[PDB]
Amino acid sequence: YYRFNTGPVGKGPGCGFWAAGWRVWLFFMRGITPLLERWLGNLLARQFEGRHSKGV
RNA sequence: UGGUUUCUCUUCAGAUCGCAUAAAUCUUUCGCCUUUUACUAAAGAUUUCCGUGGAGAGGAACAACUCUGAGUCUUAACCCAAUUUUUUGAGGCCUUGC
Numbered sequence: 001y002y003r004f005n006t007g008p009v010g011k012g013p014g015c016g017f018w019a020a021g022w023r024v025w026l027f028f029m030r031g032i033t034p035l036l037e038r039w040l041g042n043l044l045a046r047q048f049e050g051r052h053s054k055g056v
Numbered sequence: 057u058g059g060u061u062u063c064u065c066u067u068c069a070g071a072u073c074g075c076a077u078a079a080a081u082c083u084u085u086c087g088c089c090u091u092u093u094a095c096u097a098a099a100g101a102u103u104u105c106c107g108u109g110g111a112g113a114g115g116a117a118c119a120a121c122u123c124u125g126a127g128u129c130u131u132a133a134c135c136c137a138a139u140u141u142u143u144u145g146a147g148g149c150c151u152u153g154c
């Protein structure tokens with residue numbers, strides 16, 4: 001925004017440069033994918049296999 | 057002495073790259089601090105995921121070929137006659153050695 005709102009261009013909304021935040025949130029997904037695949041796999045495996053009482 | 061786009065599989069590659077950058081586990085300190093998660097911010101040890109490269113094999117061509125550029129019997133007209141070279145100052149004779 002400091003580079004965007006420099007001269008005659010004011011301080012309205014008017015700024016879609018979503019590439020930076022887009023990269024930031026996709027690099028979040030890059031690492032959250034194993035964690036959520038493991039967590040959702042255990043969720044589905046407990047729902048369809050049952051809970052093991054004193055197994056571990 | 058002479059010819060590649062795409063799909064899959066296998067294998068080997070991360071001591072200067074993937075000129076980009078996430079998460080997790082352990083162990084040790086921490087930092088807050090009702091306890092457990094969920095966390096702070098460092099060191100270390102390890103892993104997973106999104107990507108990548110080299111080689112080989114096979115498939116799908118929707119590219120087109122062999123007097124052709126380069127020959128082991130064709131094909132760069134120029135390495136082809138005045139003192140330094142591929143055109144003789146040559147010619148003649150005689151003695152020595154088993």
Ligand SMILES: O=P(O)(O)O[C@H]1[C@H](OP(=O)(O)O)[C@@H](OP(=O)(O)O)[C@H](OP(=O)(O)O)[C@@H](OP(=O)(O)O)[C@H]1OP(=O)(O)O
Binds near residue numbers: 001005011012013
């Ligand atoms: O109000 P300020 O503290 O001056 O800052 C605001 C705020 O952004 P910050 O997060 O940097 O404060 C606004 O964001 P909101 O949280 O209010 O949504 C933003 O507007 P948008 O983010 O909605 O675009 C706006 O930007 P601007 O007013 O330039 O359009 C920006 O103002 P400043 O840039 O003047 O700080």
Ligand SMILES: [Mg+2]
């Ligand atoms: Mg209790």
